[PDB]
Amino acid sequence: SYKLVCYFTNWSQDRQEPGKFTPENIDPFLCSHLIYSFASIENNKVIIKDKSEVMLYQTINSLKTKNPKLKILLSIGGYLFGSKGFHPMVDSSTSRLEFINSIILFLRNHNFDGLDVSWIYPDQKENTHFTVLIHELAEAFQKDFTKSTKERLLLTVGVSAGRQMIDNSYQVEKLAKDLDFINLLSFDFHGSWEKPLITGHNSPLSKGWQDRGPSSYYNVEYAVGYWIHKGMPSEKVVMGIPTYGHSFTLASAETTVGAPASGPGAAGPITESSGFLAYYEICQFLKGAKITWLQDQQVPYAVKGNQWVGYDDVKSMETKVQFLKNLNLGGAMIWSIDMDDFTGKSCNQGPYPLVQAVKRSLGSL
Structure with missing residues (x-):
């Protein structure tokens, strides 16, 4: 009973x-x-x-x-x-x-x-x-x-x-x-356009502990609740989930959320855009990286060298899907499917690995 x-x-x-x-x-x-x-x-x-x-x-x-x-x-x-x-x-x-x-x-x-x-x-x-x-x-x-x-x-x-x-x-x-x-459009919360310039996640499910005051507003969980508090029924909220991530060039050797950045991370080889990565680009980047799962925000990020990537992955899709079932929302919206591993040959998990995960997770009783 959900839309994709x-x-x-x-x-x-x-x-x-x-x-x-x-x-x-x-x-x-x-x-x-x-x-x-x-x-x-x-x-x-x-x-x-x-x-x-x-x-x-x-x-x-x-x-x-x-x-x-x-x-x-x-x-x-x-x-x-x-x-x-x-x-x-x-x-x-x-x-x-x-x-x-x-x-x-x-x-x-x-x-x-x-x-x-x-x-x-x-x-x-x-x-x-x-x-x-x-x-x-x-x-x-x-x-x-x-x-x-x-x-x-x-x-x-x-x-x-x-x-x-x-x-x-x-x-x-x-x-x-x-x-x-x-x-x-519950994503693009954080990117390399922020001032000051520090690492943050593109699409966090919930607030970081330290997100006080006005920052506490920029997470998927807050956005949905507010469109509901403002008068939109739940069934009419199709929740946005991204198939890309945001890239930072690390200023120091501090690899955590809030650490200082030189600027956006190196443009990807296909997407050729600074501070932006398609999931099919992300699968290669993850090769030989360190991935961490924000327990509080519920979404991962990866470090390799001086590059910091906040992205969404399968566990992220299912975690957010569960959240959306729990609040009786209309379904999930994907921006955009051309950034998922559609040919299936980058991430080697079949075409549209992320969206299949959303599709599967939605349909699962």
């Missing part, structure tokens, strides 16, 4: 082997929902910018023929898109209606089952537009439903897991009615 929502991206295909990922890589029975990241907007109309656009549709149909229970959504937004991307679409009921009408037509034309709106992040300034957009979206979906013999288009949204940003950005109460569920 998997994001996949349109830029992993530009990566080099064997990090190259296309929709053809997808196991139609892995996740319950799939989300394509990301669409965009031009002339107040939805549009996809991907040289492999038409091959996407091919796979989408092929995938859905094979799994009639599979849902596939189109996500719009994302970090790079920001708020800007949404202008000036959001500035008019006339502009927004043109937009929404194009969504409905698009998704239906291309066999999508719903729309995810990952506005990163509305914050104070766009709280209002977001809220209207969503609301107008849900309404319109409903109307389209009444007059149709098709299932009802789904509407979801990727949302922040930081308290401040949550308070600033969302009318949760309303959000709860308009959204079929949320994808809680």
Whole structure:
């Protein structure tokens, strides 16, 4: 009775082997929902910018023929898109209606089952537009439903897991009615962008003992409880779990949480991004490393030389799965499946070792 929502991206295909990922890589029975990241907007109309656009549709149909229970959504937004991307679409009921009408037509034309709106992040300034957009979206979906013999288009949204940003950005109460569920972006708590610069975990389940005051807020456990305390039912929280880790270059020889860092760890050989590692990169790094399991935070990290990696692993997946069953949440969301060991030949534990673990752990009675 849980959902497994998997994001996949349109830029992993530009990566080099064997990090190259296309929709053809997808196991139609892995996740319950799939989300394509990301669409965009031009002339107040939805549009996809991907040289492999038409091959996407091919796979989408092929995938859905094979799994009639599979849902596939189109996500719009994302970090790079920001708020800007949404202008000036959001500035008019006339502009927004043109937009929404194009969504409905698009998704239906291309066999999508719903729309995810990952506005990163509305914050104070766009709280209002977001809220209207969503609301107008849900309404319109409903109307389209009444007059149709098709299932009802789904509407979801990727949302922040930081308290401040949550308070600033969302009318949760309303959000709860308009959204079929949320994808809680409960990761990227700590990275190499922090000041001061010390090691912290990308996605801790619970707070470190020393996390006092405002830091005590940045763990998965806190984020979920707050979206619940703020008015979102549990069953509507799909909890975010990451398939990547964050990398630090150690300043001293102190290998513990809180130790000082020079900067982000060395970019990986495939991902080529400083302070970021795909799990298929992490499996190699772990070779000849020292792994420690934070008893308090419930998640591991690894040290090799002067490189510090806070990541999630199988024990991490199952531990977080248990937590989510315990709080009667909707399920798990994965960001993103192209960073898991999908070919299965890096970590040698079969394709999608992490997501299979989430999938297995969810299904286990």
